[PDB]
Enzyme design. Sequence first.
Site, PDB file in Angstrom:
ATOM      1  N   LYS A  14      -8.899  11.108  49.834  1.00  0.00           N
ATOM      2  CA  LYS A  14      -8.637  11.085  48.403  1.00  0.00           C
ATOM      3  C   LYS A  14      -7.787   9.900  47.968  1.00  0.00           C
ATOM      4  O   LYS A  14      -7.972   9.374  46.871  1.00  0.00           O
ATOM      5  CB  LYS A  14      -7.971  12.393  47.978  1.00  0.00           C
ATOM      6  CG  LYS A  14      -8.927  13.562  47.990  1.00  0.00           C
ATOM      7  CD  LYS A  14      -8.201  14.882  47.989  1.00  0.00           C
ATOM      8  CE  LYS A  14      -9.196  16.003  48.147  1.00  0.00           C
ATOM      9  NZ  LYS A  14      -8.792  16.879  49.259  1.00  0.00           N
ATOM     10  N   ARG A  28      15.583  19.695  29.706  1.00  0.00           N
ATOM     11  CA  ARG A  28      16.705  19.561  30.615  1.00  0.00           C
ATOM     12  C   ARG A  28      17.885  19.119  29.764  1.00  0.00           C
ATOM     13  O   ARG A  28      17.705  18.515  28.702  1.00  0.00           O
ATOM     14  CB  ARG A  28      16.395  18.520  31.686  1.00  0.00           C
ATOM     15  CG  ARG A  28      15.150  18.835  32.493  1.00  0.00           C
ATOM     16  CD  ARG A  28      14.893  17.793  33.568  1.00  0.00           C
ATOM     17  NE  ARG A  28      15.918  17.788  34.612  1.00  0.00           N
ATOM     18  CZ  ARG A  28      16.040  18.710  35.565  1.00  0.00           C
ATOM     19  NH1 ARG A  28      15.196  19.739  35.622  1.00  0.00           N
ATOM     20  NH2 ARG A  28      17.002  18.594  36.480  1.00  0.00           N
ATOM     21  N   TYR A  65      22.952  20.040  39.501  1.00  0.00           N
ATOM     22  CA  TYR A  65      24.247  19.533  39.079  1.00  0.00           C
ATOM     23  C   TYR A  65      25.035  19.008  40.279  1.00  0.00           C
ATOM     24  O   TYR A  65      25.494  17.865  40.285  1.00  0.00           O
ATOM     25  CB  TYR A  65      25.052  20.633  38.392  1.00  0.00           C
ATOM     26  CG  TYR A  65      26.396  20.165  37.876  1.00  0.00           C
ATOM     27  CD1 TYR A  65      26.506  19.515  36.648  1.00  0.00           C
ATOM     28  CD2 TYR A  65      27.556  20.349  38.630  1.00  0.00           C
ATOM     29  CE1 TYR A  65      27.734  19.060  36.182  1.00  0.00           C
ATOM     30  CE2 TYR A  65      28.789  19.898  38.177  1.00  0.00           C
ATOM     31  CZ  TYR A  65      28.873  19.256  36.953  1.00  0.00           C
ATOM     32  OH  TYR A  65      30.092  18.817  36.496  1.00  0.00           O
ATOM     33  N   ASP A 125      18.924  23.767  34.241  1.00  0.00           N
ATOM     34  CA  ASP A 125      19.760  24.899  33.883  1.00  0.00           C
ATOM     35  C   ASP A 125      21.088  24.721  34.592  1.00  0.00           C
ATOM     36  O   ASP A 125      21.325  23.695  35.238  1.00  0.00           O
ATOM     37  CB  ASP A 125      19.106  26.213  34.324  1.00  0.00           C
ATOM     38  CG  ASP A 125      18.966  26.328  35.831  1.00  0.00           C
ATOM     39  OD1 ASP A 125      18.385  27.333  36.289  1.00  0.00           O
ATOM     40  OD2 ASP A 125      19.431  25.425  36.565  1.00  0.00           O
ATOM     41  N   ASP A 181      23.551  26.393  37.410  1.00  0.00           N
ATOM     42  CA  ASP A 181      23.637  27.329  38.529  1.00  0.00           C
ATOM     43  C   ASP A 181      25.079  27.439  38.982  1.00  0.00           C
ATOM     44  O   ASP A 181      25.617  26.517  39.600  1.00  0.00           O
ATOM     45  CB  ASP A 181      22.778  26.819  39.672  1.00  0.00           C
ATOM     46  CG  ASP A 181      21.354  26.610  39.247  1.00  0.00           C
ATOM     47  OD1 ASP A 181      20.735  27.615  38.861  1.00  0.00           O
ATOM     48  OD2 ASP A 181      20.873  25.456  39.279  1.00  0.00           O
ATOM     49  N   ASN A 241      15.976  23.387  51.139  1.00  0.00           N
ATOM     50  CA  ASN A 241      16.287  24.689  51.723  1.00  0.00           C
ATOM     51  C   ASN A 241      15.174  25.152  52.647  1.00  0.00           C
ATOM     52  O   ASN A 241      15.425  25.586  53.768  1.00  0.00           O
ATOM     53  CB  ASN A 241      16.495  25.749  50.634  1.00  0.00           C
ATOM     54  CG  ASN A 241      17.854  25.654  49.984  1.00  0.00           C
ATOM     55  OD1 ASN A 241      18.760  25.020  50.521  1.00  0.00           O
ATOM     56  ND2 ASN A 241      18.010  26.295  48.828  1.00  0.00           N
TER      57      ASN A 241
END
Length: 325
Positions: A62, A136, A168, A177, A179, A263
């Site tokens: 691709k 944002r 942040y 947002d 957290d 994570n």
Amino acid sequence: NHNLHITEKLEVLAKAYSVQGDKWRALGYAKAINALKSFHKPVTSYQEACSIPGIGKRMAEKIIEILESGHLRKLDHISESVPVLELFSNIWGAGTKTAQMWYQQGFRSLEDIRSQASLTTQQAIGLKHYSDFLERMPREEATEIEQTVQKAAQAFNSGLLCVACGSYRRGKATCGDVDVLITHPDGRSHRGIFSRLLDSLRQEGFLTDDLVSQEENGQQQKYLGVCRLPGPGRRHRRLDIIVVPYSEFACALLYFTGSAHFNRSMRALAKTKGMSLSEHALSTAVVRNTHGAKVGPGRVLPTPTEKDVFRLLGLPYREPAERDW
DNA sequence: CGGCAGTACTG
DNA sequence: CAGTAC
DNA sequence: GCCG
Ligand SMILES: O=c1ccn([C@H]2C[C@H](O)[C@@H](COP(=O)(O)NP(=O)(O)OP(=O)(O)O)O2)c(=O)[nH]1
Ligand SMILES: [Mg+2]
Ligand code: NA
Ligand code: NA
Ligand code: NA
Ligand code: NA
Ligand code: NA
């Protein structure tokens, strides 16, 4: 980003598969697109592609078409439903299944959703703040929000440690947002504080809507809601708060700081080493079946700091900014 | 063949 | 539980 | 989708 022409064409397919619920295929594209983004030189060989980890023959072919043909024919066979599924799933609380269901029911616009869809409490809030949740905020505003929560928290216990995590902490210029992780060095004064905290934040009218908040449970771990700072020119912002016991502070901080991709990478690694990493703790000697499912609880390893988590995993420590994957 | 992170609410 | 989310 |  030397493989741009390649990514923006693949990002289209990635999102298409994602909103359609083909989660693993979308994951595959996500990783390949990722590899492409953080690479040094444009690619020229379909051998130069297979080399890059996260890119196999399928994907290579691709990119080739994207370089040579200058376009991916696959893009023209994307269901006309995708833009609408994207529109629908961008409502907080509605995922691919709900989006597909609404589409199947003939819904095509938010106007259709507003007037005829049966919405859950969360989705109604998500729709009410549709545009806001897609925007944002400058990190500066995230600071004001973290500060607002911290102030209300420390109000009834100045020992409470509050820290803005997520994008942040990784130092991004804008945040989707805020957290906020809350804990307490005494290892116990964190128990059942949501009740008080959330109530004070509501008293001052800071919190405007609650999305996830099991307040009838004294074991509540998270609060996901909506808040708005006072004054003109203010938009409703998504606010996530987690309250963790000090003993899990490092893992909770690591988890909440992310990134999400980071994570998952960390956890995948830990898994190869017979360990298990979660927002609660890093465990070792974890017994698992052939399906990779945790069969044995294992043993929790001491992790007083994030450095410890990396160390135990045999990884060089990384500042939050170095985890922005 | 089959995992792809590990976990927390909601209804 | 499936769905959705962090 | 990729990869072990
Ligand atoms: O799937 C997920 C989502 C989030 N997380 C963790 C890492 C992430 O940084 C943190 C907060 O999630 P957000 O959805 O708030 N993402 P982040 O704050 O990184 O970015 P954004 O600025 O978009 O909010 O929770 C996961 O581990 N898995
Ligand atoms: Mg965030
Ligand atoms: Na490779
Ligand atoms: Na959604
Ligand atoms: Na969402
Ligand atoms: Na969040
Ligand atoms: Na509730």
